[PDB]
Amino acid sequence: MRECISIHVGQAGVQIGNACWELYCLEHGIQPDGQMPSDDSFNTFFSETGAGKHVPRAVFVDLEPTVIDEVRTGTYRQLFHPEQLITGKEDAANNYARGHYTIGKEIIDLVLDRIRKLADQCTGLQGFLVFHSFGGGTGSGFTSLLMERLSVDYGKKSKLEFSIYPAPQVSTAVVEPYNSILTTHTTLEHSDCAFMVDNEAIYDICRRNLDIERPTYTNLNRLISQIVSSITASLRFDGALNVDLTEFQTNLVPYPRIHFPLATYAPVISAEKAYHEQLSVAEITNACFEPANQMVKCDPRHGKYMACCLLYRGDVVPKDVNAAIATIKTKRSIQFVDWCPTGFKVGINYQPPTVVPGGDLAKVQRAVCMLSNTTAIAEAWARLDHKFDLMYAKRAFVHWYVGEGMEEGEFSEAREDMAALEKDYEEVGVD
Amino acid sequence: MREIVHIQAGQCGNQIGAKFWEVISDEHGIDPTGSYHGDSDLQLERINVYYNEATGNKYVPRAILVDLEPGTMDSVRSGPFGQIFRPDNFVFGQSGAGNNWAKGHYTEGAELVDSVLDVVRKESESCDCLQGFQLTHSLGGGTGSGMGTLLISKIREEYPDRIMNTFSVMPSPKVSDTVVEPYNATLSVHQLVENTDETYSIDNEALYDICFRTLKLTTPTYGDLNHLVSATMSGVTTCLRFPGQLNADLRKLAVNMVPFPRLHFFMPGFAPLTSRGSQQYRALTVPELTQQMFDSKNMMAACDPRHGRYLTVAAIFRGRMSMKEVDEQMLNVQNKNSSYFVEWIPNNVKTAVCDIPPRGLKMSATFIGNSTAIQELFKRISEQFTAMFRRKAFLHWYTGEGMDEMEFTEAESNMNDLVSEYQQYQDATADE
Amino acid sequence: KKLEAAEERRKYQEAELLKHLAEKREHEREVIQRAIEENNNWIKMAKE
Numbered sequence: 001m002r003e004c005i006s007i008h009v010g011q012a013g014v015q016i017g018n019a020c021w022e023l024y025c026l027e028h029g030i031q032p033d034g035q036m037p038s039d040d041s042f043n044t045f046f047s048e049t050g051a052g053k054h055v056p057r058a059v060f061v062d063l064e065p066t067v068i069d070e071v072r073t074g075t076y077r078q079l080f081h082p083e084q085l086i087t088g089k090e091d092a093a094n095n096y097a098r099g100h101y102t103i104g105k106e107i108i109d110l111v112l113d114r115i116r117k118l119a120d121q122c123t124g125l126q127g128f129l130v131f132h133s134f135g136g137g138t139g140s141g142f143t144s145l146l147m148e149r150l151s152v153d154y155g156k157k158s159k160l161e162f163s164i165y166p167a168p169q170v171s172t173a174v175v176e177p178y179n180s181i182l183t184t185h186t187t188l189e190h191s192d193c194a195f196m197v198d199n200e201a202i203y204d205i206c207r208r209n210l211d212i213e214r215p216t217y218t219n220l221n222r223l224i225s226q227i228v229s230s231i232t233a234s235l236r237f238d239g240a241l242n243v244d245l246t247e248f249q250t251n252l253v254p255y256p257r258i259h260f261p262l263a264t265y266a267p268v269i270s271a272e273k274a275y276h277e278q279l280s281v282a283e284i285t286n287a288c289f290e291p292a293n294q295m296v297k298c299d300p301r302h303g304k305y306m307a308c309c310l311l312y313r314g315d316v317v318p319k320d321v322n323a324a325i326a327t328i329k330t331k332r333s334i335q336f337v338d339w340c341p342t343g344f345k346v347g348i349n350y351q352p353p354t355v356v357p358g359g360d361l362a363k364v365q366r367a368v369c370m371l372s373n374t375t376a377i378a379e380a381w382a383r384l385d386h387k388f389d390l391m392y393a394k395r396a397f398v399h400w401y402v403g404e405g406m407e408e409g410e411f412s413e414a415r416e417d418m419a420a421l422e423k424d425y426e427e428v429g430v431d
Numbered sequence: 432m433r434e435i436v437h438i439q440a441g442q443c444g445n446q447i448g449a450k451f452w453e454v455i456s457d458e459h460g461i462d463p464t465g466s467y468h469g470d471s472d473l474q475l476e477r478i479n480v481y482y483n484e485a486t487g488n489k490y491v492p493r494a495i496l497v498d499l500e501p502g503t504m505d506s507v508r509s510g511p512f513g514q515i516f517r518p519d520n521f522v523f524g525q526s527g528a529g530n531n532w533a534k535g536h537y538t539e540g541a542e543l544v545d546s547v548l549d550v551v552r553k554e555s556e557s558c559d560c561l562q563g564f565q566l567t568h569s570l571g572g573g574t575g576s577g578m579g580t581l582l583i584s585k586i587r588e589e590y591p592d593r594i595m596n597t598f599s600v601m602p603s604p605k606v607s608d609t610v611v612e613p614y615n616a617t618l619s620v621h622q623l624v625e626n627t628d629e630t631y632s633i634d635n636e637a638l639y640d641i642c643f644r645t646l647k648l649t650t651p652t653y654g655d656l657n658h659l660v661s662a663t664m665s666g667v668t669t670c671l672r673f674p675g676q677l678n679a680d681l682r683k684l685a686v687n688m689v690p691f692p693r694l695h696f697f698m699p700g701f702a703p704l705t706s707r708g709s710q711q712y713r714a715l716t717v718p719e720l721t722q723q724m725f726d727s728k729n730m731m732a733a734c735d736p737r738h739g740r741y742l743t744v745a746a747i748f749r750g751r752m753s754m755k756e757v758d759e760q761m762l763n764v765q766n767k768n769s770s771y772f773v774e775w776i777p778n779n780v781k782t783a784v785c786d787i788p789p790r791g792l793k794m795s796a797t798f799i800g801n802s803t804a805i806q807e808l809f810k811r812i813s814e815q816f817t818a819m820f821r822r823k824a825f826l827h828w829y830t831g832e833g834m835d836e837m838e839f840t841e842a843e844s845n846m847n848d849l850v851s852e853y854q855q856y857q858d859a860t861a862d863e
Numbered sequence: 864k865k866l867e868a869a870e871e872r873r874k875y876q877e878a879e880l881l882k883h884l885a886e887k888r889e890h891e892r893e894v895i896q897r898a899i900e901e902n903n904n905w906i907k908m909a910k911e
């Protein structure tokens with residue numbers, strides 16, 4: 001037994017959590033009341049009560065009650081025990097300083113007490129999965145505060161992130177670049193591996209592949225949940241690759257700071273479409289090397305790979321996979337760094353992707369998620385850093401953070417750390 | 432963040448405030464008895480932001496009505512929705528302010544202030560999570576202006592961490608009831624620069640010009656001007672009182688709108704422009720609604736937005752329309768009019784769409800702009816002030832109340848610094 | 864340390880606003896008392 005605790009912070013984190021847990025229940029045959037009329041690996045994510053009910057090993061946190069109030073009134077209100085749904089009264093008002101200091105300091109001890117109660121039910125706790133936005137005050141500020149405290153209380157215990165990188169099409173605050181840089185600086189030394197999800201990449205996939213004119217968070221989250229499920233399937237089912245949280249780090253992270261893999265998923269097919277030919281292993285593998293299927297907008301052809309993991313799911317045969325990888329190498333450069341072998345770590349998980357009934361995604365016989373650590377991801381940091389610099393040169397909005405007890409020096413420190421991170425991606429790709 | 436405590440001060444403040452309450456009650460489906468008779472769950476979702484729920488099905492405005500003169504209060508009670516207000520929330524003096532800021536701020540106002548704070552404390556302590564305060568007042572008078580700013584300072588003292596918001600009506604010679612309005616306005620602007628978090632600059636110069644020039648009303652009345660005020664107030668508060676993602680509370684609005692502490696004076700805009708009688712009207716598409724953002728003709732502050740640059744903009748679209756069309760039209764306007772938006776504040780235009788249109792219209796648009804062009808409004812007040820102050824005209828009305836000349840010099844200088852500050856950011860470049 | 868730091872940094876600026884606001888109470892009482900003392904003395908004049 002190797003349990004994983006999921007922490008959902010702020011609106012983005014909570015809403016993505018709702019999509020993930022809905023999907024896990026469909027995959028494991030768990031009803032919204034926690035009942036299942038039944039491999040056994042699902043126990044890493046769900047504990048069991050005396051009444052035979054299955055409860056997510058998760059904590060939902062928000063500084064405002066609105067979002068979580070929807071979970072406690074919704075379809076899955078019986079799935080979670082009330083104590084694992086934590087809300088404050090006053091939000092962080094899109095201010096990292098409010099989330100981290102002012103408001104966060106009041107609820108931190110309560111959140112850690114709930115996490116401790118979940119950890120006490122674990123015989124072999126692997127670690128934590130933290131879901132949050134970069135842009136919101138709770139998602140940014142509270143997450144970095146929580147990450148710091150988790151390192152103290154859970155000495156050398158694995159912590160992985162699912163971070164929502166901001167997009168202007170769906171952005172709610174002008175200050176999102178500030179919050180993003182402040183949270184990245186503070187969390188960097190506390191996270192083992194972080195999977196960024198660029199809201200624009202997801203918005204564009206929904207528009208292009210799912211024919212949704214104006215994608216909503218519901219559309220975005222369903223797609224996000226599919227990628228999260230692909231990453232976590234080998235923890236929740238008896239898988240062969242990324243079998244434990246330590247294996248994510250081992251396979252994808254060559255240096256402590258360069259811990260940001262790029263996720264690419266395929267196929268993304270519309271449900272409200274005429275019956276079509278099922279995609280082959282070659283077709284879905286080819287789709288992994290297309291920038292249009294990426295979870296973060298960036299150009300891998302302008303970067304270098306340091307690790308590549310291919311996670312197949314469903315009706316997939318090793319012979320089909322190897323043939324597909326061989327053809328790719330003949331047509332594409334697929335450039336790796338000098339100190340790394342040009343290769344792939346491949347995993348096949350026998351369960352085909354499950355989709356939400358009445359959802360936008362079509363049911364497929366086979367899917368694949370590629371997790372690659374490429375230097376091209378630095379392009380996402382550069383875009384964020386430039387927006388930060390534009391405002392910071394004029395000290396625009398800085399007073400909001402200073403007023404909450406933050407020092408201007410923390411902004412300089414956070415930005416210098418980001419400059420060092422960009423420099424690290426550049427230095428790593430050199431030869 | 433939930434409850435907003437509303438305060439109405441002076442003749443103008445109470446007139447505009449009463450209209451705000453009848454407009455929003457109609458939108459939320461609340462009748463003059465406090466009973467909800469609407470047919471949409473959206474109307475009640477965020478009802479608690481402005482209304483307290485009393486025993487049973489009744490909703491009561493979280494509003495405090497203030498004046499140094501009793502007459503205005505009687506007129507409010509007699510009104511259409513006059514019965515909806517909490518009886519204990521009417522706080523009035525007997526000795527007016529006589530259109531003298533000094534009487535409102537130091538003499539008569541100071542005598543009544545504690546009775547008002549007692550009522551605001553009652554409303555505030557009832558709150559689960561008080562966002563802050565919303566004050567409606569004029570700057571040209573004595574009560575709204577002098578006592579209103581005194582209240583802001585006294586409230587700021589007791590609730591220093593809450594958001595202070597105002598709807599401040601600027602005086603104009605075009606619709607003037609007193610020769611001393613430039614003095615009262617300047618003294619008040621000095622107070623607002625220091626004590627509020629956000630101020631909606633509602634200009635009577637602009638309202639008169641809209642009524643006369645656009646609505647073709649030969650002789651505009653306060654009723655005609657107030658119809659534009661209430662349409663604007665309904666529009667700018669849409670995000671606070673209906674479920675939404677953007678600017679859902681007073682603090683998130685301030686965080687998105689205020690880059691520098693003193694630059695918190697907003698230029699409101701509204702489309703389509705309508706007259707009280709005009710229940711016609713057959714018009715207004717998405718490209719049409721969007722075009723009126725740069726239209727000086729649609730501004731509630733007498734400034735040309737094309738004479739400055741937008742630091743930040745919030746745009747609220749109301750009615751049944753395409754969100755895709757709104758997003759396209761809004762992006763087009765920013766790309767075409769690049770030069771009127773500061774380059775050093777990326778993605779500084781935020782848009783929200785609310786399905787519920789205001790009364791009488793099927794489609795509407797409200798604009799909230801933090802523009803450097805607002806300096807034109809402050810310059811106008813400073814020049815009117817100086818014409819009088821140079822000759823120390825009517826100064827005896829103020830010094831007679833115990834005021835010193837220095838306060839006048841200080842208020843004027845602070846307002847001119849504000850103008851200079853807007854000019855500084857207008858000229859700033861992303862040379863970075 | 865880096866949190867009660869914020870807590871204490873929060874307070875200086877609140878205490879500060881309360882000073883900047885006790886100073887605004889000062890003036891008012893001064894200008895209202897000065898608004899009597901003068902009228903008190905115009906009659907001190909007038910009688911004699």
Ligand SMILES: Nc1nc2c(ncn2[C@@H]2O[C@H](COP(=O)(O)OP(=O)(O)OP(=O)(O)O)[C@@H](O)[C@H]2O)c(=O)[nH]1
Pocket residue numbers: 009010011012013015016062063064091092093094095133134135136137138139140164165166167170171172176199217218220221224
């Ligand atoms: N993908 C996705 N992004 C979301 C969702 N909700 C919010 N976001 C994004 O997250 C950012 C806004 O932060 P929020 O999570 O809403 O805010 P918060 O964490 O609750 O923090 P405060 O409200 O300030 O206390 C923006 O970039 C949004 O586009 C969601 O359900 N899905």
Ligand SMILES: Nc1nc2c(ncn2[C@@H]2O[C@H](COP(=O)(O)OP(=O)(O)O)[C@@H](O)[C@H]2O)c(=O)[nH]1
Pocket residue numbers: 440441442443444446447528529530531568569570571572573574575576600601602603606607608612635653654656657660
């Ligand atoms: N828009 C508008 N302005 C008004 C109204 N009543 C008065 N004013 C303006 O307010 C200023 C006079 O202040 P007023 O509120 O009457 O005095 P107070 O009772 O001492 O606050 C002038 O600029 C008037 O033009 C009104 O109902 N609507």
Ligand SMILES: [Mg+2]
Pocket residue numbers: 010011064091136138
């Ligand atoms: Mg939130």
